[PDB]
Amino acid sequence: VSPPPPIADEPLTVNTGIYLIESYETFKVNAFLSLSWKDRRLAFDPVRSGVRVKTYEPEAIWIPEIRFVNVENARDADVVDISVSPDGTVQYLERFSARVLSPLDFRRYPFDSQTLHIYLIVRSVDTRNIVLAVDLEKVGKNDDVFLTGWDIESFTAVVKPANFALEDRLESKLDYQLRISRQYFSYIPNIILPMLFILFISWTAFWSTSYEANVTLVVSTLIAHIAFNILVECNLPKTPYMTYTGAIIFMIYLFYFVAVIEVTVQHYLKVESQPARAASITRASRIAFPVVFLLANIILAFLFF
Amino acid sequence: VSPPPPIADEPLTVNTGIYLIESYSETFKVNAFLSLSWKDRRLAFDPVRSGVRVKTYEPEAIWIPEIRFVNVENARDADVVDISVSPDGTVQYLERFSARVLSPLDFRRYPFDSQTLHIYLIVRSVDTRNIVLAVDLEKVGKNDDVFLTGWDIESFTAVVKPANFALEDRLESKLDYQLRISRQYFSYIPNIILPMLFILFISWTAFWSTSYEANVTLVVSTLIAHIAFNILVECNLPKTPYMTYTGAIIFMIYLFYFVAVIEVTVQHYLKVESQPARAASITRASRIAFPVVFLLANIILAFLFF
Amino acid sequence: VSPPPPIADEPLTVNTGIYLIESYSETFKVNAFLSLSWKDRRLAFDPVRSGVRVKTYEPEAIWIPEIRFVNVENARDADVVDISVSPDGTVQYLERFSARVLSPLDFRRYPFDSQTLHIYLIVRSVDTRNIVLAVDLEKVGKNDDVFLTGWDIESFTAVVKPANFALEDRLESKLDYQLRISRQYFSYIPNIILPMLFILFISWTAFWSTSYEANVTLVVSTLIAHIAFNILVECNLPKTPYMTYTGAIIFMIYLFYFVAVIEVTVQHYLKVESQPARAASITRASRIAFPVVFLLANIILAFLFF
Amino acid sequence: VSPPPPIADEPLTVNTGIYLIESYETFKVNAFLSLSWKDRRLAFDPVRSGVRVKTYEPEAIWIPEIRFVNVENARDADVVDISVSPDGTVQYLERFSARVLSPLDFRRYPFDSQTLHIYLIVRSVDTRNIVLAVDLEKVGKNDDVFLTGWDIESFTAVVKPANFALEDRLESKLDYQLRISRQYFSYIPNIILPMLFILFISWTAFWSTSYEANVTLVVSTLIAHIAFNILVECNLPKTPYMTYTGAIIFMIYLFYFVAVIEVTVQHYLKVESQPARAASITRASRIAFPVVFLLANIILAFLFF
Amino acid sequence: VSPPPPIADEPLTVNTGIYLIESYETFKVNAFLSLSWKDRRLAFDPVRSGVRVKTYEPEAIWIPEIRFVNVENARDADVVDISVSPDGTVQYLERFSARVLSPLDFRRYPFDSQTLHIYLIVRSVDTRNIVLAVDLEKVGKNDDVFLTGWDIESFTAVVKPANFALEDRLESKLDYQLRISRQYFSYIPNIILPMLFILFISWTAFWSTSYEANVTLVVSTLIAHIAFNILVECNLPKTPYMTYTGAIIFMIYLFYFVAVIEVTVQHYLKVESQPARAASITRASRIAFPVVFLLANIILAFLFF
């Protein structure tokens, strides 16, 4: 079957709509794709037919070749209904389960908001040009729409389509945006708190002179920090980009090094009989370490938010 | 084929039923029988002239309602078992389907939790007539070989009254099938809480010691052992982005290792400062402070979560 | 196509058989031949006029009984090999199917266990006539290239008498195919129990020492080594929620690291308190207490599990 | 259907083209495969025919059997359009999602550029010979082409096909090259820096005489290095061949051994009462260890770059 | 369609051949399955027919049911070409991607050679008997055939088929062997070397008298060996059967135990005021431990090679 012919030179407007049935660090969505276009070749008089509307099969009529852009593979398509109104207006409906192929911006994790994108595309034919449109009454989401650890803020579409030329033929692109924000509250007692306790347990080598107990304090807590980093391996990003957590983790690895330097220096001074000077440093460190940490954290929080 | 026409204005009632064959796979898989029954007078026959009790049809041959599932992975691996039409026109459909339950678990009470797995059946009404779902209670159940290791399958029931609502200007009829399960917690004690408690107790022996070298080594080295044990039971400890009864216990333990370091640090600091009467007072208190605050805080939490 | 009609009121006997080609991938997948044989007189012929001894049909061409499997992960990868009709109308069906065995293992005796893997064949009887399953013992077996690494494939047999029962008002016939595999335990000793025992023994050398610094470092540091080794053999140590032979030994070991800490703590506490005669008495007893209670408790458990 | 016949003895030239839609330590690509060949059995006079171009179905006409060489399994094929121009010029277009089966060269990780390969092949038939060609206007990539942690430099094709015989029949291969380079900057604060801090924390046993504190310094940091190696397990290559990073990691394991030897020698001299000699070594080591490291690193950097 | 009839009582010989296009601790392969048999019912006089050969469709003619034995699931089949020669000889060609289902024998890892299997089977029919044959011109492998960390030595077939009875009907099995050997070099600097360094770092407790430093030396390195074993978890066998590497690992766990015993005894003797003896065996241990290791290793190497 060929596409419907133009009354005049005008292109075929396909009224699209996505409504999230079920939505569920990667994302998959189960939804309704609704398509509507006018094919007069199908028009009928209800009187001769004895039907308000005629229900067709996908094979029977011309259906626009609507493809998705960023998704895993050929969509799990299931046609729900095909309805033609006496005028030849085609009301298509399909149910599709699809994997969201968008990278997340981990730069502000775990205090971030993401915008998941769903791209609808149609390539225009030799016969006539096809353009995409949005039926706002056919764009939404159910309420059973859950995404554990996230707050589903919106499901909206950029109404104005992206029309552009590709391999000498025109293409019409549409942008569906699932905007989500994170449920950060558990991060404190699970990730930052114990990581901070381990670093604090190290800092008690600023009220000690025993190099044996001090080596054992700083070094043994370096092992505990690394093991805890492996414990929360999942909840920490794979990112090749600068991240808020990444720098905070890095800063900690540096603070374990500075603490070793102080400890080492202090012991060297004591061996060297400048104990008044060493005890001065170990005394300063009791306020230096927690103050530079709290400043550097505030510096970073500003640098990332 | 079009849907059957109404006698009067009434909608088409589809008598549904799910019967669990098997269950498997902290995620869940179902293998079951989906039974559907509706009246199509167009298919009706006079039993006497026809001779035969009922006639067997093919899915393509007749009109079958478009019944879809809601919380399942992808398009069901459908297999039609039998299609039977009663003299009066009522159709007896049966299919075998294997599906994955897309229902989240509530880990807030892990490992003393009961879970309600959901299977939603939906039907969209057509232009011709309206379709509504019903439940044949004789056709809703589960086999007895229905096992779910580490869980107790309590019930498989359906919320008989459907959720009828309008979506995209057309009516929809949703049905709720509930697989209620509770966990088999008894192994948790000797595998998860007991050794975690032993590690914390082994730390507390720094309350009958004055050696800061042995005390640093006691508290710090056990912190490493607790973290490594947490990695040993990584699977058995929930991922939840929400607070949990086990969630808090673990946190409380990380806090108790910190307080224990503070005491140990204070004790040795007083010792150096030559106030041993005071130091030995604290270390003596700690021998009863630490186990008492733990047992209280645990009881506080158990109440806060149950 | 409808099922063949009864000579009298008798049901249709379907002669089944499964023959193992290959087994693979603590879960198992099985690829084999499903042979089915039944009498359909509607297709019977006279050899003389036909000439041919037997004719070949296509699955679509004739009525084939709807044989389904019960405990299989995904709708069987179906491949029809051959369909043959003998002069008297006796159909000889053959298909090749690859299937995932869905049977849980009884880990109550790992790694000295014997499992019994199940394959269930089911047929639902139709309105026309009743169907019952049978077993052709000449068509039930396994190849010799049948390997299951770390297991000894003892048998492949079928419970000849089928389990007839009613379901959703219609009659059903179930068959039991049993793959009996026992373990290849010998490598367990040098890989799992031996080093775990060495770590526990390395701890016990704190019974010939008085240095609380060296004793804390001996018991505590080996606790970390035991946990790390438990993570090293994470795959071999079962996920089971139930009582297990290995799972108790692991528990008992976590307890022995606690008792040892207690002795070590008591020993130094008496030494500090100046009852050295008494402390050296305990540390001396422990040199025979610890290895004796271990060897007794192990024998107690081995009896409790075997 | 058989292939089109030759005017004379010449082979059938198939004008190929791949244009990347999607790209997503393994790689998968979603793109447009464009094919063009002349079948005059389909050719028509535009004037009498009326229509500019006739749209056919894949089954209807003869389409060359174009296969990919290094890809996972039978391609996710989806025919977009088939157009026959008046001259019989078949303009084919399909959308294919495919997994790239090319091994990476980790020798220079994380400072490496990679050339991903897509091989198009056609086997010539008994009737006539088939050869591949490249329409340069139909080879490219979109701009939404992302590969997180990589910089997509080019998508080009080796225009000259590699013609050769296989099993007595002639074959025509084409080389599509997706040249990418890595986004290395996060490697420093995540992989090399803490690994260096752990090794430095060890070296502080060159300003200490306490064998207890020295064993605890060298040995305990060896554990921390191993645990950190497990923390970055993902970001460290599996190569059976030698590598720049793999060599460094090895050199570090050796430096922890040398440091143990010094520490052991120092205390052995101390017990043996040659403290002049012991303090000489520990003094040398303060400059030996950091100098040999910085030299050996420069030696390796040159040996790999 | 039925099989071709016998001239006399002879069986149908099917000339098979597999040619590896692409190979990729588990293995998959992309190849060409070539089949050739004589079906006279298809024979033609070349002169009157004009054409040298005629191309058929799989559905059109009788093709032998050739199945594979050790592969995951039903082969991703794709028919390339079907050609009939004037005498009725059928030249079939298909492209199949398939996962090798053969167990690896790790009893010599990482100095092992492995023989990957591909079995071809055909079940004989009631009409006539079918037997498999090998066209040696149609058995091979491409040269771009790579298997990272392995050396592809051969791809050969056991020409003589295994003919046997199954469920009362005859069957014909063929053996295709992809013989590969390992690229072990990197094993030394990645697995055995650091494992040896950790064990050597332990042995420095034979030049020490400090029981605190000796407990910390032997015990702390035991943790480092276990953590390193977890670091190389991937590169080490899962085998339920004895391994050369498996016993070495075991022997090492035993050497850490012996080292604890000697340490413990030595301290015990010194406490007991018999320093003459403790010093004596500790001196023995300096040569006992490295000698028994080097002997036991040689014993094992012989026991496994």
Swiss-Prot record, chains A, D, E:
It holds the Pfam family Neur_chan_LBD. Changing residue 245 to A: Marked gain of function, with a ten-fold shift of the proton dose-response curve towards lower concentrations. Also shows slower apparent rate constants for activation and deactivation. Disulfide bonds: none annotated. Its main location: membrane. Changing residue 220 to A: Increases the binding affinity of TBA. GO terms for cellular component: plasma membrane. It is found in: Cell inner membrane. Residues 1-183, 235-242 are periplasmic. It is a multi-pass membrane protein. The keyword Ion transport applies. Coiled coil: none annotated. Cationic channel with similar permeabilities for Na(+) and K(+), that is activated by an increase of the proton concentration on the extracellular side. Displays no permeability for chloride ions. Shows slow kinetics of activation, no desensitization and a single channel conductance of 8 pS. Might contribute to adaptation to external pH change. PANTHER family: NEUROTRANSMITTER GATED ION CHANNEL. Consists of an N-terminal ligand-binding domain that encloses a wide aqueous vestibule and a transmembrane domain that forms a narrow channel. Belongs to the ligand-gated ion channel (TC 1.A.9) family. Homopentamer. This is Proton-gated ion channel. It comes from Gloeobacter violaceus (strain ATCC 29082 / PCC 7421). The lineage of its organism: Bacteria, Bacillati, Cyanobacteriota, Cyanophyceae, Gloeobacterales. The gene is glvI.
